[PDB]
Amino acid sequence: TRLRRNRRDDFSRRLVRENVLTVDDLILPVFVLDGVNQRESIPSMPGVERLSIDQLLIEAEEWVALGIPALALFPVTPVEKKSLDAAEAYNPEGIAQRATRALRERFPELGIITDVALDPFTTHGQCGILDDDGYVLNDVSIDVLVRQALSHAEAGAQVVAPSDMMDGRIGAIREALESAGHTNVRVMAYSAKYASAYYGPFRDAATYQMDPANSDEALHEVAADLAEGADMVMVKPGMPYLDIVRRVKDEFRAPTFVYQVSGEYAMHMGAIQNGWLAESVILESLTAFKRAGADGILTYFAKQAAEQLRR
Amino acid sequence: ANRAYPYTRLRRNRRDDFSRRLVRENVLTVDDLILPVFVLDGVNQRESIPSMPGVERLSIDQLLIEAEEWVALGIPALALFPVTPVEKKSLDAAEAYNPEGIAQRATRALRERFPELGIITDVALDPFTTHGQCGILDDDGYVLNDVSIDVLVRQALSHAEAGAQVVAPSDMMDGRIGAIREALESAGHTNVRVMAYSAKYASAYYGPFRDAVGSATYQMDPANSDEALHEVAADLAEGADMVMVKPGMPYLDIVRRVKDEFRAPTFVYQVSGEYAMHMGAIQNGWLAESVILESLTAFKRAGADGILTYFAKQAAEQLRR
Amino acid sequence: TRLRRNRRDDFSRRLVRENVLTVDDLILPVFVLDGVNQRESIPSMPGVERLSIDQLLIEAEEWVALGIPALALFPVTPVEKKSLDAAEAYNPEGIAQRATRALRERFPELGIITDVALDPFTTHGQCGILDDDGYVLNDVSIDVLVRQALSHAEAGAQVVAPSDMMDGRIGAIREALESAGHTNVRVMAYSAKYASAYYGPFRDAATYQMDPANSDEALHEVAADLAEGADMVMVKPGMPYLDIVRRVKDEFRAPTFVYQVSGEYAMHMGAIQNGWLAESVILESLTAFKRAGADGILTYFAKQAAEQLRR
Amino acid sequence: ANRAYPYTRLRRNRRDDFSRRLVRENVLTVDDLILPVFVLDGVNQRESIPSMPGVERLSIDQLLIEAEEWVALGIPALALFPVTPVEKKSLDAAEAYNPEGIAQRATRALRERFPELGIITDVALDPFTTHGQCGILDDDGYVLNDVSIDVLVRQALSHAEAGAQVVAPSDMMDGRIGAIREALESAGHTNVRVMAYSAKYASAYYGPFRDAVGSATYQMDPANSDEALHEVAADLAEGADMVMVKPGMPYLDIVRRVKDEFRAPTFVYQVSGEYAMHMGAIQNGWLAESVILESLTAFKRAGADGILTYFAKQAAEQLRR
Amino acid sequence: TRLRRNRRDDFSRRLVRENVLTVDDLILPVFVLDGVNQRESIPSMPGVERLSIDQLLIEAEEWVALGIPALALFPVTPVEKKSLDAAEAYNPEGIAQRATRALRERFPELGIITDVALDPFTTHGQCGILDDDGYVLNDVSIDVLVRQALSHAEAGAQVVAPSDMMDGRIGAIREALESAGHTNVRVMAYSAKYASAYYGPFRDAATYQMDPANSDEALHEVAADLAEGADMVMVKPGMPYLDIVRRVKDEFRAPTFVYQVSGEYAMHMGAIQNGWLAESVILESLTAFKRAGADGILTYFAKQAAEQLRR
Amino acid sequence: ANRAYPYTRLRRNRRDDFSRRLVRENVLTVDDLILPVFVLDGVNQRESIPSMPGVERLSIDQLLIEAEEWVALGIPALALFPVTPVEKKSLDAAEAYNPEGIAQRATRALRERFPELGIITDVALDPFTTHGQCGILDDDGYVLNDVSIDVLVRQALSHAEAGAQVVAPSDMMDGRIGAIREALESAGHTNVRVMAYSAKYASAYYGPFRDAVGSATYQMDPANSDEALHEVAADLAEGADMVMVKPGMPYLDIVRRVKDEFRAPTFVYQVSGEYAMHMGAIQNGWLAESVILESLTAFKRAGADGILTYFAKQAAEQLRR
Ligand SMILES: [K+]
Ligand SMILES: [K+]
Ligand SMILES: [K+]
Ligand SMILES: [K+]
Ligand SMILES: [K+]
Ligand SMILES: [K+]
Ligand SMILES: [Mg+2]
Ligand SMILES: [Mg+2]
Ligand SMILES: [Mg+2]
Ligand SMILES: [Mg+2]
Ligand SMILES: [Mg+2]
Ligand SMILES: [Mg+2]
Ligand SMILES: [Zn+2]
Ligand SMILES: [Zn+2]
Ligand SMILES: [Zn+2]
Ligand SMILES: [Zn+2]
Ligand SMILES: [Zn+2]
Ligand SMILES: [Zn+2]
């Protein structure tokens, strides 16, 4: 008995290979700008641009041609549209709802996953509506999140992804989608979303997010979201939490998603550009997700990877 | 879970092609396919097999030609099965270790021409015996376990000498994986893999194979599942690098228990009769061709790492669309 | 230690045999024609005939004499009786309800399992009522399925078997059976029914059926149907899904059924007729089910097998 | 599950005979039955056993006659228990390996006459010792473990020489399964099975057996269950092909743990006193005869593969209706 | 390594002994006759007598002195008091209710466990009220069982033990006990009660009882009764079902009881009287229960065993 | 379960003494008690131990007198701990195997007088070394593993020669259980049990023991639990018949994991400091005496089969009421 034997030759290695990454596993997050004919580079994320809707529709031709199953939209809210009440979240003319209708019309088979969250619409930037002590009120925030989820479903979104970490929001959003007849709008719960330093570059583009030290607690997060009606559950961030992906997949045997966040992408790309890491690291970082038990991966590398995989 | 309707509606992920693709748990690729091939003596020879429509016995020169195609489609390996001329079949099965045997020649030829292509030889003696039973017989007409194994060792080494990267003892004698592993090791063939036919049942699904090659006390009872786990545990302990379940689809439960219990490289053979019944149904217009991919997907879903299948070329063609 | 020892002799083999198939495991599916004195051979399924009720009652004498515990009825709906609303599903004079009353009268101990499904009664052939996009509406279809299940129970059926793959239908049907006093009508849920090519010959005789790639998902299907009140759960198709039978039996320890579908039967019979497989394959294919954990098997071979087992 | 009344009503499957049959989890067949038989010296001899009503000690000629019936009913095997003439009982138990001993003769006779019928011999020395204890005694009056085993090996080989397909060391010495396995192997008896009496308790349920054959520091404490799993694990490691729990019904929990833990061929002995108490109750009219099948079903339900039972013939008769 | 070592000497055997039977494990079932100064021997159960209440109170002095924790009462209903409606079940002057009040008064620390069942009060002997087909109606029987359970609690019984095998009866009885303020009356559910031949002698003294072949099904029985509020769960019969005791204890880790039924006692006693088994078999049969995972044992041997254990 | 208030009220079983008794999961008996005893040289000698109030060092004659009482109360065994005169303490610890050592004499004396009473000797060398460390020291002042074991083997045999039914290697060297088992076996002492001190921690709870007998690189880190399972697995593999956790109450979790993982005879030592802190609190009137039974119940509840406890006599007295 010697484990080096199946490694000796590529064919044996290929036969015993436990996981394979394909384009079916890739979800491309995209930053969406208001206006027309807008493209902006993000210095903290090389190779990634914020795009106005007209320019998103053009780039999406190639994403659809590459086989990318879905996009996750993250609108870039004009400063003037942020408020205490986060009303723009549910504006039928907000960027996300306009972008959803445009993409659903132009590319009917492309999955659109919208972001249900109040932080892009509050002046203070927090994931909810504040009480008089500056604490994010859970239930009152959920009422706004519910209206937002409904406006996404009305715009045609096949998937709504509540990223807010309010307790009970998955059931509250499900109940509203069910009462309104949006029977088939999927809910992708950000179940175990951690208070992480890896988010730094997304912001350029503790009382509610999880403590990085906690593993068991993630299981209780996901059990609640499945009970409350999530069709998919997600871990965020990604690589730094692969152990959490593995336990969530092993324990619940449900569709499990993972977000390779902006910071993870920045780190990898910076190292690649400096010549410190070979470009093959991209596919390796993506394989790690599959190996850990992810069914799908939100990654800003989705285009580059779909290109390498198509060849 | 406490997943309850209508909060939970399992049809939502199924509503669109994109979400189905995102949640799809298993996918078959060409890296999962092994093509078994019947190899003739001689030159410019092909023969059709009546009970295996579309499958041909091939002389080595013809095998080299088809293999060109198989390599381009990305098939990682072949399992070679010689078709022994009746003259060379003896009482003591010496043609097995003959280094000018079909297997050994076919192996040298493919190893020279396609270096990256895996070759899996058959370590057995039923194809080299007049009597046609799996090993040397005693006077009662019953397979001797250990006498059978002195021959098997010799055949195994002859294959490694030919360049075979994998030998596959299909005989179902006890303790043979260790005996061959020991012989390969001390002879210095430390990188030759052993793919044990661990859970091999006494099945009616083998009918057409006997027609392909010209030919219960050792093979497993179809009723038994736990027994299969004891068989596989002994072969891993004896040094098997990979273990196999045979037949295939009729034993998908075994594949799944064997994978769950050992988390070892696990292989399954879609045998001749499985191929014949699918193909016949496809030819009568009773089933659609997409049944081929479905059958193979089932193996992946059950936990198989690789699949020995006569559909390997068609499946590889279909996967490339 | 040598595992060949208990195989050496038939008596030891018999002692250590882990599973045995008996007639108690066999359910015969039967195709039922309208009219009188009708018998039709099915070319895609040799040895199987569609039968009018009068002829079904005659053949059932031998099925009862052989010990076959139950029949599963599949009516062959006249073209003219198919409609958009699938109303014939719940017709007290439909074939299935007439056939049930006739069999319950003539053979009171023989189990009758009816098929709760809309596909034999829709002009478009889909398992439900369509919305204006051509998608099978879940809840509206369940209302029709409920009326059908009630009409089967009124006809005397001891078991109703919802084959439709609508979410929630098992609980909706249970609730209606319980409210109407049909306290003991069993519900045999088709829990994990896959979108399969093996069904081709039944049709001669994706958004709701399961993807063949998915295993874990089958567990969630069956957990819901048990919670919703199924007395038995079923996997369909059969042989190609024995791994699913095994996991369902191991995980839930509930009465587990499997359908050896028309395609599986065709494949086996064709091969037998061509001389490619020995006839002993029939009992081997049936044993595989038992070994995998099935308690019962719907098989078109039920008659042939009960004959081989009686000897 | 979240199975809740009234959505879930467990009586629905029980409402009709047909649904009960469909969901029935276990079924007893004749393939599960082993008939233990007390074998006399001599010719045209039968003796009734007072504490085992309906069971007869049988000379070999009589055993051959009854076995005709047992074979026709499909009983797969007998467990032979010789009734040693008091003359042949010695200090060093040499009658054990005597090839004209009852067991060895009875075995040759059944193996010649009914070739397909399994014979399971008893490897022990309590029946061949003046003292009546299970093995050679030292001067303190206590069973020597390893000295006992030098005799057992010899008896075991004498049975295999007679044609016994299974030997069953019932002694409860440690390390004896390996010692016998080693001796059978090197003597070339590679297909003789060893059915280890693995979990054998110090039970009051054995009373009548001592009456049948004329006759705590080794047998297990009735209070212990985990201990049984350690006993069985050692016997499998030592080469046992099958393991047994004895007594039976009073230890159904052990049968179930032993099956769940090892997934190995597991046997259980419904001992003399179990038979006597059921039969006596049946004769007094206190229990119905259907108790026989119920008792046997319980073993199957618990996980037993085979059952050593004095009811084997009656049960086989009842199963055929 | 040799397992015979700890067996060599009694002290080691005693140290490693995994289970011990004590009097705390014993519940004595008792047959109660109407009238005064009545004692009747039971030929099918030697050493056991039916007793009128006055004579039960006398014998109970010795049962209490021996440490027997509880009695299970089984009234011997006068023929004239049996009816179609089973009304005597809930009669405040029925034998069981009179016997309960008398024992609760005289021996306040002795546990009384009453039998909630309709079979001793129906003219036909079945465990419920029949419909017009001769089938035991489940829900209607539960209404009578509920009134009976209430009459036991009013008489002072600390434990009511529903032996009837009606689905849902444990929750229905719990709900009624809770609504009436009988907050602490324990419910000992006969969860897995099998249709058994071992009951023959009790009768002297299939559509609702379990099939002896079924194991898994017992787990579903007990899961329902725990969910519905049972404080204790029981397997009946005993020895023939020790595998069921073991799995119930392992799976649920709840207070588990077992009934060594009349037939088991008869068999053992007959054999002892004929000299076929030593008297030590009694303690061995009782130890088997403890070893299998029973917390308590209903046994007619409770007196004899408490005597052997006291010495 | 889906057990929910108010359908489920866990106080109902607690409402009366009878139901509490019926559901009581564990019960302590005298069969669970082992009395450790400090044994003096000489005659008519008793000494009080300041840090162990109520416990006396006893010359063998006095030990024989008290043991009368211990045997009548049903205590199954004693664990002997000699108190070595400072003269007999050497560099190479030879007093260990001296057959006129306290242990060996005390053992012969109890084995003759109370044949049924179990004696568990201490196989160690810290009590026989001038330096006071557990084994022969090298020049760095660190315990040599294997040199220590050559002495231990010799002490072990000397105890078996004295009649000790159990030896208990308390040293915490690796591989010592196998070395002693091997030596006992080949010397013919096949029934001497080995009770391995498997999970023995580097604890502050041992303070008073050192006072009782006059006296981190080997003992386990208190922070570690998984490590304990690896220790116990090696000792079972090496032939231990019983394994022990020490200290006790501060390690009840270890007792529970060790029992759950191996289902082997598992013992726990309520060490000197556990005894001292309870007893002191009882003497100050801070805790009631019933704490003794509570502490012992906890061991049973945790899964201990037997408990080495200085409270053994008081507990046995209390259990008899
Ligand atoms: K995927
Ligand atoms: K693979
Ligand atoms: K069945
Ligand atoms: K069997
Ligand atoms: K108890
Ligand atoms: K103990
Ligand atoms: Mg949450
Ligand atoms: Mg093998
Ligand atoms: Mg469903
Ligand atoms: Mg043993
Ligand atoms: Mg119930
Ligand atoms: Mg150690
Ligand atoms: Zn947010
Ligand atoms: Zn072969
Ligand atoms: Zn349908
Ligand atoms: Zn014996
Ligand atoms: Zn009743
Ligand atoms: Zn020490």
Coordinates of N, CA, C and O and ligand atoms in Angstrom, one line a residue, chain C residues 166 169 221 225, ligand 9:
Chain C
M166 N -46.0 17.7 -7.4 CA -46.4 19.0 -6.9 C -45.9 19.1 -5.4 O -46.0 18.1 -4.7
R169 N -48.5 18.3 -1.9 CA -49.7 17.6 -2.3 C -50.1 16.5 -1.4 O -51.2 16.2 -1.3
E221 N -37.1 15.5 -0.2 CA -38.4 15.2 -0.8 C -39.2 14.2 0.2 O -40.4 14.4 0.5
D225 N -42.7 14.5 2.6 CA -43.8 13.6 2.4 C -44.2 12.8 3.7 O -45.3 12.6 3.9
Ligands
MG9 MG -42.3 16.6 -3.0

